[PDB]
Amino acid sequence: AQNPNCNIMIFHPTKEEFNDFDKYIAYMESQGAHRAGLAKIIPPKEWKARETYDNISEILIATPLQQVASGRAGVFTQYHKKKKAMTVGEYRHLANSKKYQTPPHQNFEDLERKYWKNRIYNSPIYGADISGSLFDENTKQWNLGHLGTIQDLLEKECGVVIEGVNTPYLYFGMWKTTFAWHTEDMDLYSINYLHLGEPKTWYVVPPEHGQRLERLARELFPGSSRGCGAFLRHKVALISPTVLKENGIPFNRITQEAGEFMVTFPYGYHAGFNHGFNCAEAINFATPRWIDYGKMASQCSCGEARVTFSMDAFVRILQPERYDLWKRGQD
Ligand SMILES: O=C(O)CNC(=O)C(=O)O
Ligand SMILES: [Mg+2]
Ligand code: NI
Ligand SMILES: [Zn+2]
């Protein structure tokens, strides 16, 4: 078995190898990459996402989210308070202010320590989940706005024809902005490209051990667990590496820098934070191997997680028994 310790693998494709996205994903899996839950892909040196970022300040963040924490430093929840709209120019200036900027630090490790020590005492503002793309239309390789769609994957593998569309989303981050422990909707893959700015640190649990993280989360967030049988779908819970180590949960960590892709694999729980002002683009995708994970994915039926138009069809076709009760939560 390849990659039996479930380490995060890093790939350096040549420009020739960067032409066929599906094939490269299948290659990475042939080497065991999926066992980690997360892989890094460093694009060929010749490749670029776009020519410059010189005119991005005019993008609107219509609903910036202030991430307010509750709990203790290693075990907390976050709630997202909606703020008034601001442009990326406004947001970047805010990120760089004395109140919100990255503190002085020695290296990524010292900054990681400062994040876990101090996150809960601050409320950074995240411009998340903005439909759009920063890839130039002429970028032909690994352009997250030109991938094969999940609906088309389901049609090719299963023959069924469904409504829905699949488009990317932009994320504008600042110091301490946080993504809580989650898997993707319907346990899909994700791919995330860091267009610009400061790094993003990731933590991940191998898919084969995801249920160990779930059991810990039920112990650490016991009222959330009683409220919903899949409350990590709410994307609100944080658990630090120290706490994971104390409880014997297998995990890995890696820092993504500007110009790099990350791939998350089906049922790979992940969480993380941004080091400073940055912009990432991400989208879900499927392969044939995903189909069985889609059939088995948990669902939030308490109604909090409240998910997309396109996820309806996935549930209807892959989880017809759940269909009914899941759409009662989503209506
Ligand atoms: O970048 C972020 O804030 C969160 N991204 C993801 O969880 C992802 O790409 O799957
Ligand atoms: Mg602009
Ligand atoms: Ni994710
Ligand atoms: Zn729920």
Side-chain angles (χ1 to χ4, degrees), residues 1-47 49-50 52-81 83-214 216-244 246-305 307-327 329-330:
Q2 291 268 231
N3 193 26
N5 281 358
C6 302
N7 292 318
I8 296 168
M9 302 177 68
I10 301 165
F11 294 86
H12 285 88
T14 59
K15 59 182 191 334
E16 295 73 28
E17 287 172 327
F18 216 55
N19 281 306
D20 182 340
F21 185 88
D22 294 345
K23 182 176 178 181
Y24 200 81
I25 301 298
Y27 170 69
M28 292 159 62
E29 297 190 352
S30 76
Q31 304 305 293
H34 60 295
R35 300 190 63 176
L38 182 69
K40 176 179 286 195
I41 309 91
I42 294 172
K45 70 191 177 294
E46 302 86 0
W47 180 94
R50 67 178 300 106
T52 80
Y53 294 83
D54 273 337
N55 298 96
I56 69 166
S57 312
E58 311 312 302
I59 294 165
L60 195 69
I61 312 170
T63 312
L65 306 174
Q66 179 173 56
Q67 300 188 298
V68 180
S70 303
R72 60 181 176 101
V75 181
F76 62 94
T77 62
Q78 58 186 13
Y79 93 86
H80 290 160
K81 184 169 174 159
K83 309 297 279 188
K84 291 185 168 184
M86 77 179 84
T87 65
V88 165
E90 290 165 335
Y91 179 89
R92 180 176 62 218
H93 190 258
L94 180 71
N96 289 342
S97 66
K98 292 184 185 175
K99 174 171 182 52
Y100 290 101
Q101 72 183 217
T102 318
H105 61 282
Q106 299 295 340
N107 52 41
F108 293 166
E109 183 166 353
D110 184 37
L111 193 66
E112 180 186 37
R113 179 190 70 69
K114 287 178 193 290
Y115 172 83
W116 296 105
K117 187 181 154 51
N118 299 319
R119 165 63 187 90
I120 67 169
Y121 303 112
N122 295 86
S123 304
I125 292 174
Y126 210 168
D129 290 311
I130 297 163
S131 293
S133 185
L134 286 168
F135 287 86
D136 187 316
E137 67 177 3
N138 296 317
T139 295
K140 296 321 176 176
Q141 298 172 329
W142 288 53
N143 180 324
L144 298 191
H146 296 173
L147 301 181
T149 67
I150 299 158
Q151 298 76 17
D152 284 343
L153 179 289
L154 195 144
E155 184 178 330
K156 292 185 293 195
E157 293 298 300
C158 303
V160 77
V161 183
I162 54 174
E163 70 290 357
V165 296
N166 181 198
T167 53
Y169 295 89
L170 304 176
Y171 301 82
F172 290 96
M174 67 170 60
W175 170 236
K176 288 174 179 167
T177 54
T178 301
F179 51 109
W181 282 104
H182 72 283
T183 61
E184 303 305 305
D185 290 341
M186 217 74 185
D187 301 338
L188 285 158
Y189 297 68
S190 63
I191 180 165
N192 182 301
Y193 181 65
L194 193 53
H195 281 282
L196 63 95
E198 305 308 314
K200 191 189 290 287
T201 291
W202 300 68
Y203 301 95
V204 59
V205 172
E208 73 199 66
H209 304 299
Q211 291 92 356
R212 298 189 185 213
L213 182 70
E214 298 172 351
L216 178 61
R218 292 192 302 269
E219 293 162 0
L220 295 175
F221 304 99
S224 294
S225 182
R226 286 183 290 270
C228 180
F231 77 94
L232 296 177
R233 302 269 172 216
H234 314 164
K235 310 194 297 189
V236 301
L238 278 300
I239 307 162
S240 74
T242 295
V243 174
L244 292 179
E246 286 170 342
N247 291 276
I249 310 303
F251 76 95
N252 283 298
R253 78 190 90 189
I254 194 170
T255 301
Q256 178 191 21
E257 302 186 71
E260 306 180 336
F261 289 90
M262 308 296 297
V263 167
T264 83
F265 292 85
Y267 197 63
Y269 275 105
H270 55 282
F273 63 93
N274 294 301
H275 291 207
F277 174 72
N278 65 16
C279 172
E281 180 168 343
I283 197 179
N284 295 120
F285 71 94
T287 70
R289 195 176 65 82
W290 166 70
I291 297 273
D292 283 340
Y293 291 84
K295 294 176 183 164
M296 293 169 329
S298 67
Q299 308 295 350
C300 170
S301 318
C302 84
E304 283 294 300
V307 309
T308 187
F309 183 94
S310 311
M311 223 195 106
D312 188 279
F314 306 152
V315 182
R316 189 172 76 248
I317 300 305
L318 294 181
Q319 307 183 315
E321 186 241 10
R322 289 188 170 158
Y323 191 69
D324 288 33
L325 180 73
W326 164 93
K327 195 169 44 59
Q330 243 357 337

